Each structure stands twice: as C-alpha cells, then as structure tokens.
Amino acid sequence: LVKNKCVNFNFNGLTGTGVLTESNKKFLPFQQFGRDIADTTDAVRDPQ
Amino acid sequence: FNKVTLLICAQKFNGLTVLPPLLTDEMI
C-alpha cells in the first residue's frame, strides 16, 4: 500500500485515480466505504 | 461586504471552475 502520490487506486475491487493522504471520518465502526455530496468515494478503509 | 456573504473545491473536483475576476475588489 502506497500513499501521498497519484496511483490508479484499486481498493476492495473498486478503483479510480487520485492522491490519497490520510483520514479522519472515523466510519461508524461497522462502516466501510466513504462518500461525499456527489459521493465520489471520499474515503476508503485500506483493508489490507 | 460583511453583510452579503455565502464544498467549493469539492465541486471543483468534477470539472467545475470559478475563474477569478479581472477587477479585484481593492481596484473597484
């Protein structure tokens, strides 16, 4: 797992490209995949 | 100014763009 640089991120099968820095949202513990206004995958829990 | 007041970079991340004015306030 690599961070802080553009990769074609492919997490849990789901994909996309961007620069992945950190996280703060603290999914309601059960929760897995984050979303925003356009839902646009605004987070992911690296599940490695 | 203070009365009339209002994400932005988020919708930017969809193709949005808000070009800045040529006449900034101070000049106006």
From Swiss-Prot, chain A:
Attaches the virion to the cell membrane by interacting with host receptor, initiating the infection. The major receptor is host ACE2. When S2/S2' has been cleaved, binding to the receptor triggers direct fusion at the cell membrane. When S2/S2' has not been cleaved, binding to the receptor results in internalization of the virus by endocytosis using host TFRC and GRM2 and leading to fusion of the virion membrane with the host endosomal membrane. Alternatively, may use NRP1/NRP2 and integrin as entry receptors. Binds to host ACE2. RBD also interacts with the N-linked glycan on 'Asn-90' of ACE2. Cleavage of S generates a polybasic C-terminal sequence on S1 that binds to host Neuropilin-1 (NRP1) and Neuropilin-2 (NRP2) receptors. Interacts with host integrin alpha-5/beta-1 (ITGA5:ITGB1) and with ACE2 in complex with integrin alpha-5/beta-1 (ITGA5:ITGB1). May interact via cytoplasmic c-terminus with M protein. May interact (via N-terminus) with host bilirubin and biliverdin, thereby preventing antibody binding to the SARS-CoV-2 spike NTD via an allosteric mechanism. This is Spike protein S1. The lineage of its organism: Viruses, Riboviria, Orthornavirae, Pisuviricota, Pisoniviricetes.
